[PDB]
Amino acid sequence: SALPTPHEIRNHLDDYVIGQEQAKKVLAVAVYNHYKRLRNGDTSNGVELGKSNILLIGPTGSGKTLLAETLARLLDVPFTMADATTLTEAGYVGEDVENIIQKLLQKCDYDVQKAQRGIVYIDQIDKISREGVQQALLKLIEGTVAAFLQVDTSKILFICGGAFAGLDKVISHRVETGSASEGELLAQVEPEDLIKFGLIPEFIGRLPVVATLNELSEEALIQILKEPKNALTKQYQALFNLEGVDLEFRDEALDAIAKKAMARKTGARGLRSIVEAALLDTMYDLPSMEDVEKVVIDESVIDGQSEPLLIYG
Amino acid sequence: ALPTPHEIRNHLDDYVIGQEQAKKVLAVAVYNHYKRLRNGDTSNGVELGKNILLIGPTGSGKTLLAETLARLLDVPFTMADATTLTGYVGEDVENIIQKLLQKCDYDVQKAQRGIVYIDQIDKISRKSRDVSGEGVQQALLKLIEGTVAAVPEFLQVDTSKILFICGGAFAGLDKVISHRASEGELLAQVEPEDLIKFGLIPEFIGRLPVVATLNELSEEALIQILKEPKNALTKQYQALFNLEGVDLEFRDEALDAIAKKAMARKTGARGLRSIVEAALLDTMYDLPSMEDVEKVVIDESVIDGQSEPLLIYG
Amino acid sequence: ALPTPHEIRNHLDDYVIGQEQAKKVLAVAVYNHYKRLRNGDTSNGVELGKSNILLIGPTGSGKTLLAETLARLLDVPFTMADATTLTEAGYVGEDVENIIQKLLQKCDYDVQKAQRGIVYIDQIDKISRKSDNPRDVSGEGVQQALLKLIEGTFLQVDTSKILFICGGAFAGLDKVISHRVETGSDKASEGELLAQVEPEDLIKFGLIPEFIGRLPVVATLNELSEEALIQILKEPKNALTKQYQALFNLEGVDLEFRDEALDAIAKKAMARKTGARGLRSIVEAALLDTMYDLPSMEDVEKVVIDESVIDGQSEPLLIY
Amino acid sequence: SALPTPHEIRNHLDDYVIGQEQAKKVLAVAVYNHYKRLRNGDTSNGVELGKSNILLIGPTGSGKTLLAETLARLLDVPFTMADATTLTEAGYVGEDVENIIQKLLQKCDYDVQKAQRGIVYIDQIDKISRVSGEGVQQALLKLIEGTVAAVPQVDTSKILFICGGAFAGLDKVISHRVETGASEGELLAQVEPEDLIKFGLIPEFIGRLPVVATLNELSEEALIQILKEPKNALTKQYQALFNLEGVDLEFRDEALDAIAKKAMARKTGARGLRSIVEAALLDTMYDLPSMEDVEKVVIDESVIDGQSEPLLIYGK
Amino acid sequence: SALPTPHEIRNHLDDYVIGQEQAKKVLAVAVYNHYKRLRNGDTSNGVELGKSNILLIGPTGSGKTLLAETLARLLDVPFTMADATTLTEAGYVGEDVENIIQKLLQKCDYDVQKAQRGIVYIDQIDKISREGVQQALLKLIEGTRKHPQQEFLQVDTSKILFICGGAFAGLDKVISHRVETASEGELLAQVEPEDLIKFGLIPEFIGRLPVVATLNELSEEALIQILKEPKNALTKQYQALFNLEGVDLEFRDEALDAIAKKAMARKTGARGLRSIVEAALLDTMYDLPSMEDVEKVVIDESVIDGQSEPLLIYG
Amino acid sequence: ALPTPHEIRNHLDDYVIGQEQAKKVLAVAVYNHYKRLRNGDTGKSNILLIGPTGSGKTLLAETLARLLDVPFTMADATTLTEAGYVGEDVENIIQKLLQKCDYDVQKAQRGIVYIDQIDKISRNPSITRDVSGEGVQQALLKLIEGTVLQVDTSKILFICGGAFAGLDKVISHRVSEGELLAQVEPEDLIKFGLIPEFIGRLPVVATLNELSEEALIQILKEPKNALTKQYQALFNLEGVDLEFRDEALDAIAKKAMARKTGARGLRSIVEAALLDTMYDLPSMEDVEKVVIDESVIDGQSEPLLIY
Ligand SMILES: Nc1ncnc2c1ncn2[C@@H]1O[C@H](COP(=O)(O)OP(=O)(O)O)[C@@H](O)[C@H]1O
Ligand SMILES: Nc1ncnc2c1ncn2[C@@H]1O[C@H](COP(=O)(O)OP(=O)(O)O)[C@@H](O)[C@H]1O
Ligand SMILES: Nc1ncnc2c1ncn2[C@@H]1O[C@H](COP(=O)(O)OP(=O)(O)O)[C@@H](O)[C@H]1O
Ligand SMILES: Nc1ncnc2c1ncn2[C@@H]1O[C@H](COP(=O)(O)OP(=O)(O)O)[C@@H](O)[C@H]1O
Ligand SMILES: [Mg+2]
Ligand SMILES: [Mg+2]
C-alpha cells in the first residue's frame, strides 16, 4: 500500500503529542526515509546498507516514549520498548539484549519480515554512560546473512531516548565563545558533546539523527490533559460514562493539575497519579449512588479539601 | 457479582484490619477492571491504559488481600513468586497461565476473569541470580499484554483480560522517596519515578498505574506466617524439640499473642523469631536435662512471659 | 556423647567470666547445631534451623574466647577470620574460600571433620554499609559473598554443616536500638538495650536482610565489670600478674601487685573501652622503667601500688 | 602470490579513505607482513620474530576506525572493535578483555583458525594512559602476548591488533622533547616511543606496538573530496535518497566548499560532515514528498548562511 | 656467656643512633626479656611467658631500621629485613613468608638454633592496612646429608623476634580524635592498640605486637650529631677513606650544619645525608689520588653552595 | 698497582663518548671499592646506573672490569624474575663468575657483576606464573648481602643498570629530563617501587643523558631479536636477501642519537628507510637488497637492487 509523506506523519503525531514541532519534523523525515529505503531495498548500489537510527534527547515526561509508540501505530508496525539502565552493567544482559529481539519477535509474531519493519525504543541510554553495554547495541543494530534471529537487525528502526541531565552543561562549555535557555542549548548539540558525556564514538556514529524535546510548559500539560486522542480526561470521562455519569473538568481544575505536576517535576507521566487521586473517593462510592453529572473544580484538585460537585436527575 | 467498590471494601474489612485507603484503591481498581472487561476497552471511540502494585511490609496483608478479592468475586486465583522464576524461562511465565486454567477447570473465559498475584517484584529490582529475576520480569511484562499460545484445539486465553496484582516490600523505596514508624505518609507520596530509581523499568511501571500502600502489619497474616509456611518458625522449633523426644505444641492464642507483640514493635515478620526464641530459651536450655512427653506454649507464656511453658511428664 | 547445654555452659564458666546470658544462648545454639548434624538433620524433607550465631559485645568482652572455647569443649576444628580483610574484592570472594582451606588444614584435611568445624568472623559490624563511620559497594559484596558460604555449597566440602559465629562491637548499634525502643520522651543501660536488639536494628545499622536472616541466634555480651577485669588479672592460669611475677622471678626478685593497683588497672582499661585486650598494654607501661633497670639492681622484691599505675608518676617500691 | 600486495592493499584503501597516503603505505606493509608471516608460520626462522602491532595516531574523524575496518574487508578477515575507555574500568576487570575474543569468534562463526587471522581495533588508547587503569594495559598487553583460554581455543598471538588514539597531549611532548624550532603533520612524524612513555603509556605496551602510523588533519580540499569521491560519499547518498522521489539533487561546488569550511571550524573532521548536510536538507526533505519538482540545487548561500532555501526547479 | 642488661643494650644503641632515648629504653627491655625467655624456656615455674614482639612507629628516616639492625649486631644474632609491600596483593605471599625464613637461614649458616634466636624486621607495616597478609604475618608472628635446604622448615617462627616498623601517616590524626573531648611525638606517646585498629590493623595482629615504640622527627641538631658522633658516622667513614691516601679530612662545624640544613629541605631525613656529603666530596675524591696534599678542609661554602672546592693544604 | 680515578676515567673515555659526570662517579666508586679491598677492610660502594637504553651502561661496566683485569659477568633481572622453578637463579651468576675466574675464590671476590633492567622488577598480579619483581628484589638482595665452595658476595662489586622510564616523573612531582635525573634521591627510587633495603645497598647513583653510538650499533645486530635480523627475516619470506652495510648501521645510530630517542627510536628510523622498498618489493623479483649509509643518512638514494 501507499506510504504516508513526512507531512502526513507529522500531522498524526500532532494528535497524540503536544508541541515539540521541531522534533516531530525530524522524526517524520527520519522515519519516512527509513521505510522508503527499506522498500527500495537495502540500497540503490548496495552501499548504504539501509540502516538508520534516531536519538531522542529530552527531559523526563517530555513525550519521547509517546513519540516512538505513536510512530509505530501510524505505520502499523510492531513496536517494542526496552530500558538501557536495566541493561547496563550486566553480561547476561548482553545475552538479554537479544531479549529485546525476543521481545519484538513476540509482538511481531515471529513473522521476521514484519520484525524487520518494526521499531525498537531504548530508554535511559544516557544513564549507561559515565560503554560495553553500548557495544551490545551496536552488535544489536547489525545483522549479517551468509545464505534465534532469522532477520538481520540492520533493517529494524532504532530510537534511543535519554534525559542527558549533564549534557546541557558540556554543550555550554563547548559553546562558551563570544565574539532556562535549555532549548537553545540542545539545538547546538553535536556528536562530540555526546562523546564527552560518555557515549562511545562508535555508538554515536550509528545514531546520525538527533531530535531534541523541550521541557513541557504549564499550558503544554493542560493540552496534554485534553487534546490527545487518549488524554487522561477523555479516559476518565469514558470510565464515568459506563456508570451513566458525565464527568466534567473545569479549565481551572486542569490548570491546577498541571501546576502540581510541574512542582513534582514528574512531567506528563505524573499527571495520571494526580488525577487518579482527585477522583479516588468519588470513583469509590459512585457506583453506589445515581447522579447525572460530576464536576471537578480546581478546589477539589489542588487543596483536595473539597469533594467534587454532584448533580442529580 | 460485580459488587460496587463500597461492597468490595466492606468484604475486605472482614479479612484485613486497617489500611482503609489501600482497601478503597483496590476496590476501585478491581471494580473498574471487571466493569471495563465486560464492556471492553474497544468501542466508544476511546482506549484505556488499564493493574495494581501493592507496596507494604512483609506480613501486612498483601497476599491476603489478593486472595480475598478473588473469593468475593468468585474468580479463579493464582499466586506466583518473583524469586522462584522457574532454561528458556518461558515456561515459568506460561505455567502461571496454565495453573490459572487448571484452577479454572480449563474454561478460557473464566481464566480471563482470573486474578494473578506476583510476589517479590521488589526483589527483581535492587537499589545501591539478580539477572535471572529481572529477565523474568521482562518475560512477565510480556504476559500481561497480548495472547499467549497454548502449550503444545489449543484454544488459548488472552492474557490482557486477566487482572495482575504485584506485591513487594520495597525496603529501599522508603529512602529514594524521601530523597526525591510513620513511613506511611512517605509511601503516599510514592511516584512512578521513585520506582524507576528503585530499579523498575519504565515499561513495567506504566503497566502498573495503580499503587496501593500499607501502613500497618496484619495480625492474621503474621499468625499464618508462623504456621503455614513450610519453613514456619513453629515447625522449625517443633523439629528441634522432636530431636529431644519432646512434643512442642503452640496454642492458637499463643501464636496470636506472638503477632500482637511483633506488631507493637513494628519489627514485622523478622521480629517474630526473636519473640519465639525468647519464649523457648529457658526451656530449650534445661530441656535436655529432664524427661517429659510434651511441652505446651500458651498466650500467658508469651505475652506476660510470667509463666513458663507447660510440661507434661511421663 | 553430646554435652547438654547445661554442661556446655558449665565448661564455658571455667574459661569465661560473666556473660551468663550469652553463654546460655551459645550453649543452646551449639547443642542444637551439632544435635541436628548428628541426626543428619531430617530424612527426606523437613525443616531445620541454620543455628548460625551473631555475637554482639564491646571490645575485650570475650567474643573470641567464647568461640575458641566452644570448639575446644567439642573437640572440633576452629578457624578465625577478619571481615575487614575480606571487604573490597572480587578476588577476596576467592579469598573467602581460603577460610575453608585453613579449616581443612587444622582438620587434617578430613572433609567430614571440617563440616563439624566452627568458623568465627570478627569485625562484622565494620563491613556494614551505612552513613555512620563513612568502600560501601565493596563491604556489601563481602556480606553477600560470605552470605553464600553461610548457606553452604577442589576440597568438595559443603559449608552448610559448619557453624558460623560472627562477632562485632557494633558501636553505633546502641544508638539505633535506643531510637526505636524509646517511649515518648530513657533506657537503663547498654546491656539492657542490647537485649532489646532486633534484626531491623541491624538492618538500619548497615547489615543486609538476607545476611541477618542467616544469623538467627543473637548473643549479647556485657561490658566486663571492674571486678571481672580484676579477676582476669589474677585468677587465670596465665594471668598477666602471674606472667610478670614469673619474669621478675628469674631475676631473683618478688613482684607484688597491690589490690588497689589491680583495680587501678581495670579502671584505666574501662576508660579506654579496650576491655581485657587493653590490660597488657597498661601493665607493660607501668612496669617498663622497672624492668629496664631491674637487671642492674640487687633488691629482694618490688611492690606495685595504685600510685605507680594510675598516676604513673611514682616508681614501684623497691625492697632491699 | 595469492595474498594481496602492499601496493594492492593501499589501492583498496584509497577507495574508502581519502588522503593519509603515508599512513596507508605503513598499514599496507604492516598488514601484508603480518599475514605473510602467518601463512609461512610463526617465527619459522631460527631468529626470533616479533608480531607487528599497529598504533594509529590521528585526530578524531581522521579515518583511523575506517582504515581498520577496510583492511579486514580487503583480506576477508573477521574484524571486531573495542574501546579502551569502555574496558578501562570494570568490576570484572581484565577478564572482560577476553570477551572481545568471544566477539571475534561470533563474527567468525566460531572458527578457531579464522579467529587467529582476525583483526582487533582498540579505540581511545590514549585515554587509559594517565592508573590501576594502566593495569588494564597489562591485561590488554597479555592478550598481545597470547595463550588466553577461549570459551571451549584462540591464539591471540596470531591475531593482529590495531590501537587508535587522538593523543591530544602527545603533540606537546613531541615538540617539547625535540624542542621544535602549525607543523602538526610534521611534528607527528617525529613521534617516538619515548614521547608515548612521557604521555603515560607503559614501555612494555609500546614495545608491543612496533608499527606507528600518523594521520594528517583533513585539508579543506580533503573534506570536499570526501563529500564527492568515495563510493559511500554523503552527496551520493542524499542524491540517491532524492532520486527515490524522482528528484535530481545537485550540489554546487561552492556548496561543497561551504560544507567543508563549516566542518573545519567545528574541528569535528569528517564525522561532522553528515550533521551539517542533514541540517541543510532537513526542511527540503520534509516537504519534498508533498510537492513535485524535477530537481533541487544546493548552493553555498543555502548551506553557510542557512538563510535561503534550496532552489526548486519544475522539470518539463 | 651472660645476657646483656637493658642498660648495656641502650648504651650500645646510643653509639649508632642519635636521640630516640625513649624508644631505645623500650626496645632494650623488649629485646632483653625476649632472649631472657628463650634461655629459661617457654614455660617458667608452671606459667607460660608471653612473647613480646615489637611495633616501631616513627617518621621515615628516623632510625627504625637502624635500630633493628643495631640490636642484632650487639647481640651477635642473625638479622634479616623484609618489606610488607612485596608480600601484599598476592597469593604467593604465604610462600614468601617461608622465603623470609630461608633468608634468615642463609645469613645464619642454616643453623636452625641460631636462626630461631634471630631477628626479623618488617618495614612498611602501615602500608598493608587500607590485610590477608596480616593473616599470613599473624600466623608467622604467632609461630609454627643434603646440600639443599632439606628440612628448611625444621625452624619454627615462634622463637624468632619480630620487629615491625611503619610511618603510620594517618595514625597521628586517629590519636587526636580520641584525645579531644617532637610535638608529634607527644601525640604518638598516647597511642593505644585501639588507634591501630581504627587505622586498619586487625585486632589479632595488634595483639601479637604488645610492645609499641615511637620515634621523633629528626631536628637539625640531631642530623649534625648523626654526622659525627655515631661509630659509623659519615664524617668518620670519609675521613678513613681520605686516610688511605695519607690525607687528613676535616669538616668545619659550619659545614656539618650546612649539610643538615640541606637534608631537612629534602625531608629525606638521615637517609639523604650520605648523598649530600658524597656530592660535596666527589670532585675531591676523584683528583685526590693524583696529587700530594697534607690535609683537606670542607667548609659550609663548599657544601651548601657547591661553588667553592675544599681547601687544600700542602706539606 | 691500582689505577687512579683519573686513570680510570681516562680509560673510559676511549670506550664511551660523553657522560663525563657518570664516569667520574664510577671512577671514584670503583677506586674506593678496590682500595678498600686492598690492604684489607681495616663495606658497600655498590653502584646504580640510571640511563636510557643504549646509553653505555653495559659497556661502562665491561670496560671497568677489563681495565682492572677483574672477572666480570652480566645478569638480567627479567631472566632472574622466575628465579627458576626450583632453587635460586641468583646463585647461578656467582657460578658463572667463578668459571670466568677459573674457580679462584679470591679473584671471584674481586669480580664485578652487572645486573640489567633493575627498574623492571619494581612493581594486578592476576595469578601470573611469572614471579613478582618485588620478590625478585629480595632474591637479588640476598645476593648483594653476603652469604653466611663458599663465596661471600660482599667483596664483589655490584653494578645495577636501568632505564627507569617512570622515575623522571616521580622526581618532577617531588620537586629538563637530564637535569632532573641529577636531583634523584633514594626517596624517588622508593616511590618508583624499589624497597628501602635494596636502595640502601646502592649508595652510589650515576646518570647518563645521551646515547652511545657503539652500543646502538651493537643493539642493531647482536641481539637475537635485533632489528636487522627481524627485517632480514621479513625480506626472506619474499625470497630476497637483505644486507645492511656497516656504514648504514652507524648512520642509523647517529640519527637515533641526534633525536635522543634511544634504542626504541631505532625501529622508526629503519622502518622509514625500508618503507618504500618493502612497499613495492612484492611486485618485483630480485635476489637481494643492499642498504648503504646513503640510503639511511640522506634518504637521498634508494637501496641497491640485485636481480
Ligand atoms: N506532548 C505530549 N502530548 C500528549 N501527551 C503526552 C505528551 N508528553 C507526554 N504525554 C503523555 O505522558 C506520558 C509520559 O510521556 P513520555 O513519553 O514518557 O515522556 P518521556 O519519554 O520524556 O519520559 C505518556 O504516556 C503520554 O501519554
Ligand atoms: N570473660 C572473660 N574471661 C576470661 N578471659 C577473658 C574474658 N574476656 C576477655 N578475656 C581475655 O582477654 C583476651 C581477649 O578477649 P576477646 O575474646 O578477644 O574479647 P573480644 O572478642 O570481645 O575482643 C583473651 O585472651 C582472654 O584471656
Ligand atoms: N580520510 C577519509 N576519507 C574518506 N572518509 C573519511 C576519512 N576520514 C573519515 N571519514 C568519514 O568519517 C567517518 C568517521 O571516520 P573515522 O574512521 O571514525 O575516523 P577516526 O577513526 O579518526 O574517528 C566515516 O564514516 C568516514 O566515511
Ligand atoms: N637517629 C638516628 N641516628 C643515627 N642515624 C640515623 C638515625 N636515623 C636514621 N639514621 C640513618 O639514616 C638511614 C636510614 O634510616 P632508617 O632507620 O632506615 O629509616 P626509617 O626510620 O624510615 O626506617 C640509616 O642508614 C641510618 O644510618
Ligand atoms: Mg622525540
Ligand atoms: Mg645513609
Side-chain angles (χ1 to χ4, degrees), chain B residues 1-5 7-8 30-35 38 72-73:
Chain B
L2 192 48
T4 68
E7 298 181 355
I8 294 181
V30 171
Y31 182 75
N32 296 356
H33 178 82
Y34 286 104
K35 192 177 190 61
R38 176 77 61 80
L72 173 62
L73 301 180

Side-chain angles (χ1 to χ4, degrees), chain E residues 234 270-274:
Chain E
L234 282 176
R271 285 183 173 273
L273 283 186
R274 189 184 180 285

